[PDB]
Every structure is written in structure tokens, then in C-alpha cells.
């Protein structure tokens, strides 16, 4: 299981958000902590991504692009898994110090997006997703959203995506296998609409931000203003397995 060996070896460890759980919840404090967490996890997503089998085959502009287009989906999927494994989807386990109960879901003003993420989390149990299936699906997710006009070196991306699909089929193979690939790819497809809803909410927040006054950091202001609108405007779109 060379491939699975590597995926387990590069998998990032726990990441905390830095949230003050001793203060009462507010919209501003929750979103500041999600921004901080989002930025800390992005660092781990880059380290992880650069270590993936064949990732260096990609043109370096495409390496950078692909991480920024898929990072929200990656985080959503990974958070859903943590939620499932740590608290049986009872709450959303963003980080060990940032666990969302329904009240925080409501307070964050992202209730509809949280309910969908909690549903994603429950499917990990309904489908009895293995940790090894989890690792392969998450890797495939990195290669599942691209510009409609193509990447700098599209052929190398194509063959890379192909190999990750082949390895996912492998640990399903290792009929039954038929129904399973179907179910897992439906689950993967469902990640993308949730990431877009998070993007739309947060884009709107950045723009109005002057009014709802919330300090957008660093890398976040850049990614939401430079890359995220490509996705919201349809210039960058998910690669779906199934027709939506």
C-alpha cells in the first residue's frame, strides 16, 4: 500500500484556532477565529499538498492555483471527518478549541452552511467511510476544481487527476465496488456547493466589512478578493463526477 503509506505519512496533525472560549460568543469573535484558523490550516494545506505523489509534475503556476481554488473544499471535507470521528457529528469540530454547537452555528450567521456541513459529517458515518478512503478522497479533492479556460499545463494536471482516481478505485477494489465508487463520488461532488456558499458569504462580508467592521487579515483578503471571485463568477468551476 505504497500510496496509502504516503498519504498517512503526510497527513497534517491537529490545528488549534486560538479562540477565547472564556468570553461569550459574538459574530465578530467567531469570524475572527475562523479567519485565523483558515489561515493556519492553509499553511498545512500547502505543506501537505507539496508533498503529494506527483504534485511537482504540475507547472508551478498550476500548483499554486490549484491549492487556492480547492483549499476551502479541503477544509470543509477535513472538518466534516473530524466532526464525525471526534463527536459523532453532534457538533462541528473546526478545531479542538473551536467546536460549534447550534448556538454558535446561529451566532456565526452561517447556520444554513453549518447544517450542510453537519450533514456531510453524518454521511461519513452513514456510508461507513474508512480512514483510508477518507485520505484518498481528500487527496482527489485537491484536483477537483479548475479554470474553465484550462490550466497552464493542462495535460499534466489531467494525468495527475487520473492517477488519484485510479488509487481511490484501488482501495475500493481492495457490484459492491461499483455501488461504492458511485456513493463516494456523490459525496465528493457535494463538497463543492458548500464551499461556494462559504465563499459567497465571506466575499459579501469582506466587501461590506467597512460596515460590519471586521479586520480581514493577510492572506485572507488577498484570496477572497483575487481568487474567490473567479469561482463566484464561473471562470473557475468544480470538476463534477455526476451531472448536478
Amino acid at each position: 500500500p505504497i500510496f496509502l503509506n504516503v498519504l498517512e505519512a503526510i497527513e497534517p496533525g491537529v490545528v488549534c484556532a486560538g479562540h477565547d472560549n472564556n468570553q461569550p460568543d459574538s459574530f465578530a469573535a467567531l469570524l475572527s477565529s475562523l479567519n485565523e484558523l483558515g489561515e493556519r490550516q492553509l499553511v498545512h494545506v500547502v505543506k501537505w499538498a507539496k508533498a503529494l505523489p506527483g504534485f511537482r509534475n504540475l507547472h508551478v503556476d498550476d500548483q499554486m492555483a490549484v491549492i487556492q481554488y480547492s483549499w476551502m473544499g479541503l477544509m470543509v471535507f477535513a472538518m466534516g471527518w473530524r466532526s464525525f470521528t471526534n463527536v459523532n457529528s453532534r457538533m462541528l469540530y473546526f478545531a479542538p478549541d473551536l467546536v460549534f454547537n447550534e448556538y454558535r452555528m446561529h451566532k456565526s450567521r452561517m447556520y444554513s452552511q453549518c447544517v450542510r456541513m453537519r450533514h456531510l459529517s453524518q454521511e461519513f458515518g452513514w456510508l461507513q467511510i474508512t480512514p483510508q478512503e477518507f485520505l484518498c478522497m481528500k487527496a482527489l479533492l485537491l484536483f477537483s476544481i479548475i479554470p474553465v479556460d484550462g490550466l497552464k499545463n493542462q495535460k499534466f494536471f489531467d494525468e495527475l487527476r487520473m492517477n488519484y482516481i485510479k488509487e481511490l478505485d484501488r482501495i475500493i477494489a481492495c457490484t459492491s465496488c461499483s455501488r461504492r465508487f458511485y456513493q463516494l463520488t456523490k459525496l465528493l461532488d457535494s463538497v463543492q456547493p458548500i464551499a461556494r456558499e462559504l465563499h459567497q458569504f465571506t466575499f459579501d462580508l469582506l466587501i461590506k466589512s467597512h460596515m460590519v467592521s471586521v479586520d480581514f487579515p493577510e492572506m485572507m483578503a488577498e484570496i477572497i478578493s483575487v481568487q474567490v471571485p473567479k469561482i463566484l463568477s464561473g471562470k473557475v468551476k468544480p470538476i463534477y463526477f455526476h451531472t448536478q
Partner: peptide, 11 residues
């Protein structure tokens, strides 16, 4: 850009 700085910062 900030993202490129990060990306390049990673070994």
C-alpha cells in the same frame, strides 16, 4: 502576493 510568499516559503 501573500500567498505566493507562503508557497515559496515552504520547502
Amino acid at each position: 502576493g501573500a500567498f505566493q510568499n507562503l508557497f515559496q516559503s515552504v520547502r
